[PDB]
């Protein structure tokens, strides 16, 4: 009306008035203002019942929709009834008051900049024969303790030793031996629930592979019972996306780890793998707060562990090392002890494989070498072969450590390239050429004639590994490993596609594509040399 005139309605009830109101506003076509006159602290239900139905810009209760009462203004802080526009007429177009950002145009300029590389380690480690008593001697008043182990090893006269030493000053403990070859999404929560019933304050990780890392996982689940778990995985998938925060531990428990298998560097790495229960979805966890603060590397354990599981672990470590050195993530830092472990292993593998426990020299030597390898790729990530072998082990239940050991050969032949600039990225930046690096390894072992070219040294290198791995009595084609090959061909197709993106990604200097993986897989299965 816009004039000193008004028409009224005769409403029936609260809801009748509300209906008439909504119907009345829509006629304007712009939701601007609407008013409620009512009792105010006997009726809140009414307040926001009414608020729920009405879509103006702005609701006032027991207030005139203007400016200027007594003194300052009624109401004294509010935009004017004008200044409320919208970019649309259409309907329900809730007006918004105007601001200079509606009158101003933007810029962001992003800068070019450099990155962060890394080297971080667990603080505390011990290493000898009979470490255990003298290692744990420094365990004063840490009062509650929890065991993580496997029923095979707990079944052996091993756990008894540590619980006795826990009684030595006397700890309230409980053994947990209820993990099989893998983290499951099933034991993890029962273990978490049991210990959080116990509220232990020290966690004892025992063994090889699955027992330790699953613990870590459910360990952290004790730290935050509140959160769900995907986003622990989904949020933190790999390195260098330090975005943004931690699940917040160091809290109410510490980690003391005991390896048993010579060949896994897991007990130092901040890594974990968990498997889903429908279809076994892989979930990789990787961030440095996962590193245990306590690591002990005794030997007493493996004098009696038989061949060639020895070989399996050693070959896993071997793979870890050679991939780590050539990794694009390789700083100078990992090169030192990676080279060290590689050099020092070449003598003590044949002896320990042939001799043990008659040779209580080579066994602990290769144990330490494997630990050093774990030190190495703790910062340099894995190679494509590693997750790919994860896969081959996955479908055919093949153990880790030898599955990759069947691959390494062709793998470096894939790296055996002069300059294919087909898919490589940023080649001449920090990684001049892998071939040279390999040759440095070769002559660095002295595996080369003083007068040689690179490729000469390279073939010497992988010949060395060839009959070296001959020495340890392993099949040379995966068919010789006992695999039905018709289905191999049938299912290698999708095997390769998941082999591509399985976190490899990957410091692999060169891109693979789906095709090359397939060539390599078939060549390795037949023991054929992948060469082009």
């Amino acid at each position: 009306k816009l004039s000193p005139t008004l028409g009224l309605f005769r409403a029936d009830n609260f809801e009748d008035a509300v209906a008439q109101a909504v119907t009345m506003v829509e006629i304007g076509g712009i939701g601007h203002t609407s008013g409620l006159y009512t009792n105010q602290d006997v009726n809140a239900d009414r307040i926001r019942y009414f608020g729920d139905k009405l879509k103006t810009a702005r609701i006032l209760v027991n207030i005139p929709t203007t400016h200027g009462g007594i003194g300052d203004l009624y109401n004294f802080n509010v935009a004017p009834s004008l200044t409320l526009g919208c970019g649309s007429w259409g309907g329900n177009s809730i007006s918004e008051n105007v601001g200079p950002k509606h009158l101003i145009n933007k810029k962001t300029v992003a800068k070019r900049a450099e990155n962060m590389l890394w080297h971080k380690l667990p603080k505390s480690i011990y290493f000898r024969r009979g470490s255990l008593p003298i290692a744990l001697s420094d365990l004063e008043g840490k009062k509650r303790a929890f065991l993580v182990t496997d029923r095979f090893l707990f079944n052996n006269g091993y756990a008894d030793d540590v619980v006795a030493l826990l009684k030595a000053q006397g700890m309230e403990v409980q053994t947990f031996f209820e993990v099989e070859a893998d983290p499951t999404l099933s034991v993890v929560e029962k273990g978490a629930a049991a210990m959080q019933s116990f509220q232990p304050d020290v966690i004892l990780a025992l063994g090889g592979g699955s027992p330790m890392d699953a613990a870590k996982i459910m360990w952290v689940m004790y730290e935050h019972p509140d959160t769900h778990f995907e986003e622990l995985a989904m949020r933190f998938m790999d390195i260098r996306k330090r975005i943004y925060k931690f699940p917040k531990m160091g809290k109410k428990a510490e980690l003391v780890c005991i390896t048993t298998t010579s060949g896994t560097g897991s007990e130092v790495t901040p890594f974990a793998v968990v498997t889903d229960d429908k279809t076994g979805a892989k979930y990789p966890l990787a961030d440095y707060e996962l590193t245990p603060q306590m690591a002990i590397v005794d030997a007493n354990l493996v004098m009696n562990m038989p061949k060639s599981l020895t070989a399996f672990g050693g070959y896993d470590a071997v793979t870890h090392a050679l991939e780590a050195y050539v990794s694009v993530l390789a700083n100078e830092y990992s090169d030192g002890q990676a080279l060290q472990a590689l050099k020092m292993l070449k003598e003590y593998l044949p002896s320990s494989y042939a001799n043990g426990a008659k040779d209580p020299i080579a066994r602990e030597k290769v144990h330490n070498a494997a630990t050093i390898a774990g030190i190495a790729f703790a910062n340099a990530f894995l190679g494509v072969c590693h997750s790919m072998a994860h896969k081959i082990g996955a479908e055919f239940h093949l153990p880790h450590g030898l599955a990759n050991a069947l691959l390494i050969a062709n793998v470096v032949r894939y790296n055996a390239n002069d300059n294919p600039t087909k898919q490589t990225a940023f080649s001449q930046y920090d990684r001049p050429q892998a071939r040279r690096r390999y040759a440095e390894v070769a002559d660095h072992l002295g595996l080369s004639q003083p007068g040689d070219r690179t490729a000469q040294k390279i073939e010497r290198l992988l010949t060395w590994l060839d009959e070296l791995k001959v020495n340890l009595d392993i099949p040379k084609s995966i068919q010789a490993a006992g695999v039905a090959e018709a289905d191999f061909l049938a299912k290698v197709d999708e095997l390769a596609v998941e082999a591509f993106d399985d976190q490899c990604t990957g410091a692999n200097p060169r891109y693979p594509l789906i095709a090359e993986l397939k060539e390599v897989l078939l060549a390795s299965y037949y023991g054929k040399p992948f060469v082009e």
């Binding site: 008439q20 609407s34 009726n43 200044t83 007006s95």
Partner: protein
């Protein structure tokens, strides 16, 4: 015509905020006072170091002139308010536009 004065100074002032240039379409009803304000505010601005003008406004405003500048290429934006019929032609421009208007403003009173 309802608020020929406050709106003009409003827009002009916030424009000089945005380091802008503003063009005015006064109503043939209420233009002389609006143009007087245009003078006055520009004069204040000039006696502060402003460029010789930042205001434009229409003398004897007419519909075809309004459509011509409203469809002028050089203009970057338009600010309309008032009659519903007005802002709808404003939206019918293929150009960015926002219109300040209102609808029927209802109040309801209960027994309590």
């Amino acid at each position: 015509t309802t608020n020929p004065t406050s709106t003009a100074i409003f827009k002009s002032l916030i424009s000089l905020k945005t380091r802008n240039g503003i063009i005015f379409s006064p109503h043939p009803r209420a233009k002389n006072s609006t143009n007087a304000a245009a003078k006055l505010v520009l004069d204040a601005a000039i006696a502060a170091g402003a460029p010789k003008d930042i205001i434009g406004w229409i003398d004897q405003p007419s519909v075809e002139l309004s459509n011509a500048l409203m469809k002028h290429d050089g203009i970057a934006l338009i600010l309309a308010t008032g009659g519903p019929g007005m802002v709808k032609a404003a939206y019918s421009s293929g150009k960015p536009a926002i219109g300040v208007g209102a609808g029927n403003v209802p109040v309801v009173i209960d027994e309590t």
